[PDB]
Each structure stands twice: as C-alpha cells, then as structure tokens.
Amino acid sequence: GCFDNTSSTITVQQLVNLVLSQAGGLCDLPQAGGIGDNDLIAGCIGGAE
Amino acid sequence: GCFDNTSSTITVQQLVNLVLSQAGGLCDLPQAGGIGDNDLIAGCIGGAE
Amino acid sequence: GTGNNTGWFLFDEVNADSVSITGAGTGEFIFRGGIEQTDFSLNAPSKLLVENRSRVGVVNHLNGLMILKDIGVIVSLTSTAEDNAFTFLAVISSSLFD
Numbered sequence: 001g002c003f004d005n006t007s008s009t010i011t012v013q014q015l016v017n018l019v020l021s022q023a024g025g026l027c028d029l030p031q032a033g034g035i036g037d038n039d040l041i042a043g044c045i046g047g048a049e
Numbered sequence: 050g051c052f053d054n055t056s057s058t059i060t061v062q063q064l065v066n067l068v069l070s071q072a073g074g075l076c077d078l079p080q081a082g083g084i085g086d087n088d089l090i091a092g093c094i095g096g097a098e
Numbered sequence: 099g100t101g102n103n104t105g106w107f108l109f110d111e112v113n114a115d116s117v118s119i120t121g122a123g124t125g126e127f128i129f130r131g132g133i134e135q136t137d138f139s140l141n142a143p144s145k146l147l148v149e150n151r152s153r154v155g156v157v158n159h160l161n162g163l164m165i166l167k168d169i170g171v172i173v174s175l176t177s178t179a180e181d182n183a184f185t186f187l188a189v190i191s192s193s194l195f196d
Contacts, residue, residue: 009051016071023072030104030124032094034183041092042075049075095182096161097122097143 099123103144116155119144119162124184135173140164143184159187171196 001010042049052059091098103123110130116137119127126145135153140146141160148154149167157166159177163185166172169192179185 012050016068019068020072026091029091029098031089032097032183036095036182039092039094039182041090044075047076095143095180095184097124097184 099125099127099142099144119146138164143182145184161185164188166190166192168192 001008003010050057050059099119100121101123102121103125106126106128108128108130111132112129113132113134114136115134117129117139119140119142121142124143124145127147129148130150132151135155136151137155137157138146138148139158139160140162141158142162145163145165147165147167148169151168152170153173154166154169154171155173157164157172157175159175159179161179161184164187166189168190172192172194175194177187179187
C-alpha cells in the first residue's frame, strides 16, 4: 500500500478490524408491513443458523 | 501482499472467504430471555430480508 | 440493477432501449420522460415507478411493486407475482389501445 505517502505494509489483522467496524447490525434492516404464510424465520436450530 | 515471505497474490474471493471466518454469526449473539410486543423479529420475507 | 440497493433513484429524459431489475434489493427506482419505446421487467422486492411517458414497450411483472402512471400507450402487460407485503400492481390513467 501507499499508506501515509510511504511504500509500506500493514498487517492483515489491522484491515480486518477496520472492516468489522463497518459491518452493521440488524437494526438497519427494512421493516416489513406484514407476514405471509410462506415466510421463513432465521434461528439457531441444531446449534447453527 | 507478503505471504510466508513470498511475493504472491490472492483473489478478492479468497480474501472475502477469510473475512467472514471472523464475523461468526447468530451464534455469537447474546441471549435476552424476555421479549415485549414492540420488539421486532428477523427473517426472510418474499425473497427479502 | 442487481444486488442490494437502498434509497431512491431518479432518471429524467433518460432514453433507454430496455430496463431490468433483479436481486434482493429494496430500493425505489423512479422514471420520467423519454421518447423511446422502452421495455421493463422487474423481479425483485424493490419498488418501481413510471410516469409521464408517451410509450412503453413490453412490460413484465414477476415480483416487487409496480405503479404504472400516466402512460400514453402500452404495447403489452403481464403479471404472475405472488402475495407478499412487498408486491402489488397498480395502474393509473393509461391505455392499452394504440
């Protein structure tokens, strides 16, 4: 990379941490106005999503 | 980037696969136990989230 | 248009040979004007609006919300969507009779 106008390098971890900070949360999802009879709900069944 | 002290390259797809390995998933979520009416639930609706 | 989309988009006097929308995005595409017989095909949970056009080519409605408004002429219309909170077809002041 060209960090701070210098030919240098950064750890993989540093980038990953920066990425996760922008991950976002479920609270930003749109709010549906109704529920059908073929909808699917996500949950931890058998210990997995 | 520098990998095992080797000047090689990796596709973004590979990078993406690695990144999610740390994001975990719903299992990481805490537990609340008690729920109210005004709360909201998550799921897949008519092909949308 | 594909993938996840949010917010509102506007096109004005944007002549186009055809338009296609897919994916799981939930944005709002707004069209307006133009002087070409454009086609449409929406299969997504997005919201689609068209208004103030002299003509529109073939139209397909597989999913999403389509609102046809104030169109001079429509070549043909189709619809096979299914009931969900994001889907509804509404037409306003437009004729199929050339």
